Design an enzyme around this catalytic site. Sequence first.
Site, PDB file in Angstrom:
ATOM      1  N   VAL A 117       8.636  -0.492   0.429  1.00 28.69           N
ATOM      2  CA  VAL A 117       8.642   0.929   0.099  1.00 28.69           C
ATOM      3  C   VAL A 117       7.702   1.525   1.416  1.00 28.69           C
ATOM      4  CG1 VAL A 117       7.714   2.492  -1.406  1.00 28.69           C
ATOM      5  CG2 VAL A 117       8.840   0.769  -2.307  1.00 28.69           C
ATOM      6  N   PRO A 170       6.232  -5.030   0.439  1.00 29.02           N
ATOM      7  CA  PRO A 170       4.956  -4.128   0.850  1.00 29.02           C
ATOM      8  C   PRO A 170       5.110  -2.547   0.606  1.00 29.02           C
ATOM      9  CG  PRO A 170       5.933  -5.249   2.502  1.00 29.02           C
ATOM     10  CD  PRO A 170       6.505  -5.861   1.443  1.00 29.02           C
ATOM     11  N   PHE A 171       3.913  -1.833   0.870  1.00 28.30           N
ATOM     12  CA  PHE A 171       3.999  -0.529   0.760  1.00 28.30           C
ATOM     13  C   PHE A 171       3.356   0.056   2.112  1.00 28.30           C
ATOM     14  CE2 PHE A 171       1.479   3.510   0.199  1.00 28.30           C
ATOM     15  CZ  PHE A 171       2.529   4.363  -0.418  1.00 28.30           C
ATOM     16  N   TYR A 203      -1.089  -6.586  -7.417  1.00 33.68           N
ATOM     17  CA  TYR A 203       0.336  -5.791  -6.527  1.00 33.68           C
ATOM     18  C   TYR A 203       1.334  -6.067  -7.872  1.00 33.68           C
ATOM     19  CZ  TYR A 203       3.298  -4.264  -2.898  1.00 33.68           C
ATOM     20  OH  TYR A 203       4.332  -3.571  -2.149  1.00 33.68           O
TER      21      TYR A 203
END
Lengths: 66, 65, 63, 66, 65, 67
Positions: B42, B1-2, A53
């Site tokens: 996001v 995070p996404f 990530y």
Amino acid sequence: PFINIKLVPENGGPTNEQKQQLIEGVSDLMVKVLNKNKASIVVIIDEVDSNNYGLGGESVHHLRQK
Amino acid sequence: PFINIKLVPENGGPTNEQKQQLIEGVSDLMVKVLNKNKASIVVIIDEVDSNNYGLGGESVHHLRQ
Amino acid sequence: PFINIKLVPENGGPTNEQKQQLIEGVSDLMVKVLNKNKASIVVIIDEVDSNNYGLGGESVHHL
Amino acid sequence: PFINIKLVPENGGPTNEQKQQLIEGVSDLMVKVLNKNKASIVVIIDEVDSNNYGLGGESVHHLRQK
Amino acid sequence: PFINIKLVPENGGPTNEQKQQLIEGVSDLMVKVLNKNKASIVVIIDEVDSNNYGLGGESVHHLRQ
Amino acid sequence: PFINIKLVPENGGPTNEQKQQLIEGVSDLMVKVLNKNKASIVVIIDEVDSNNYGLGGESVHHLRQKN
């Protein structure tokens, strides 16, 4: 609707209970904001290794080392 | 995070305001459930044509009519 | 390999030439860092409306 | 911007160092082409089992045998 | 199960009928192979602009003269 | 084209053979409907833990408790 949540494991989290909180939570949001049909709401949580990530051009692992 | 939300438009919506509520709601949810850093959260909302979304084998178009 | 790039358009960008630059840039990156099969590289660029992209709880349109 | 990279591990790669090079390279490309906010760049690398990735109708696990 | 199909339109295809065919096709495939529950099968078809799809480092638009 | 299939494992499956059947199945489907080029077809199957997949607001682990 379909909701994909990708995050990095942190402090033994998220637990199965927390994933459930996210699943139910995200699903309820769709119903509250768009009055969507919760029955058809699909949710998938992907857990990404801290090394896979990147944010700002650096890995989450490299960032947490700070 | 996404977070990626994919949905089929309907009744002139989702409006830009509803979209804002989704981004806020998902972001707050992450911060509340996992103490995530909202600053890094996001979110992307994709709107799919009713003829391009299928459930149970049928298109959302045929399902709504 | 498969590469998905999602971004919000702005200032008339990205043009079709810049999209090609991204496709070449990413494709050459995989071959240079992993020596993967250049011919098997798939790249998909998605342009997201400013009102549909969020960062920090706010839409890019708001920002 | 968000970039998702899906590949099949091979010969011990990508290593945590190579993943960093992908995250760095990807983030630098977005800045060099469209001058996007580098700090807002999210990158996720997914490693797919060779038996779970198909190309041309055949799995990668097989193609690597040719 | 969730199936996402991303393709580049061409010569007017895929039509709404061809999209339906993909939805039923993929859905039936899941039932036949893993006996999955049809009703839970979600299918999303994304139509990608030829200038936005790349293969081998060449855009689909350029890879077609 | 590109086809991403996300499913939850169950009862010793899906096997490599079944994953291969999915890869060929989806590929043939694309060739049959749009005459797409076989060689350009990419398929990625993701296996999601029953606790990471939700439908109707409930994780699949929970749904599978009921037959």
